[PDB]
């Protein structure tokens, strides 16, 4: 199917507690594969998935050089943004960056991304054309001018259409037994009375990968969007994910309710009901 690579950078200032922390993690789809943390006893790029371990010394050294350099440039950038917003030196602030490439089911580039935020708000993003920028405010317009002057977009475009896709393809092949395996959800419906007159039906999906899934309840074949309690999809810790959806129904009316499950790993979409 479709696949993506992303790097996520977080740079956090902490006045009075040393220099800003820089952390980078890399993902293919829902699988992390590398980390770097400037706070580590010996900051270096470390593998986080077995299929990346086969990369040579030059790969690790090159990654580490890049993240060490970013640690320094992001510290300068934090200073710069503090100034752009006329902020005092007393507060802690965060720059986040997420970038990478998306491939379609044929393996060709679907689109690229290079997005930044400041204190959790959109700051600047590379447009889908990979040639122009969208700045959130007049501070970000200053970054935009700097990046335009330095032809940054042209360099991101080269990476996103080139190395990004090339490496993602390599990782997909090297990790094909996991990265290209969809594990379908194991499902069941539970029943718990909440009173004499109502009961909870909870539809469970466990052990699935990737995280993308759709869980809905219908009553008489009609979507119950407003009445359904849906927890956020959550990691199990073994690569797989979990989710449930719950509905409170009148006792006696249980068979009017159906749980529907869509997941990439499913030969056919599931329809489930409570089985007393």
């Amino acid at each position: 199917g479709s696949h993506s690579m992303r790097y996520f950078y977080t740079a956090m200032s902490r006045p009075g507690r040393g220099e800003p922390r820089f952390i980078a993690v890399g993902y293919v789809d829902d699988t992390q594969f590398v980390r770097f943390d400037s706070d580590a006893a010996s900051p270096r790029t470390e593998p986080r998935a077995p299929w990346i371990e086969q990369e040579g010394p030059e790969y690790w050294d090159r990654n580490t050089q890049i993240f060490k350099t970013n640690t320094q440039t992001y510290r300068e950038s934090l200073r710069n943004l503090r100034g752009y917003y006329n902020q005092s030196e007393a507060g802690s602030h965060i720059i986040q960056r997420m970038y990478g490439c998306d491939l379609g089911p044929d393996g060709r580039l679907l689109r690229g991304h290079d997005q930044s935020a400041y204190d959790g708000k959109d700051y600047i993003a590379l447009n889908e054309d990979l040639s122009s920028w969208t700045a959130a405010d007049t501070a970000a317009q200053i970054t935009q001018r700097k990046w335009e002057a330095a032809r940054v977009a042209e360099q991101r475009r080269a990476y996103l259409e080139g190395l990004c896709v090339e490496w993602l393809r390599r990782y997909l092949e090297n990790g094909k037994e996991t990265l290209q395996r969809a594990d379908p959800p194991k499902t069941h419906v539970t029943h718990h009375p909440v009173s004499d007159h109502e009961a909870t039906l909870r539809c469970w999906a466990l052990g699935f990968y990737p995280a993308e899934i759709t869980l809905t309840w219908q009553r008489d074949g009609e979507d119950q969007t407003q009445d359904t309690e849906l927890v956020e999809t959550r990691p199990a810790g073994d690569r797989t994910f979990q989710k449930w959806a719950a509905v409170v129904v009148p006792s006696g009316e249980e068979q009017r309710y159906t749980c529907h499950v869509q997941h990439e790993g499913l030969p056919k979409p599931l329809t489930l009901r409570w089985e007393p």
Partner: peptide, 11 residues
């Protein structure tokens, strides 16, 4: 593999 930068890249 992550992307590189020109020297002295900054926001």
């Amino acid at each position: 593999h992550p992307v590189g930068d020109a020297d002295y890249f900054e926001y």
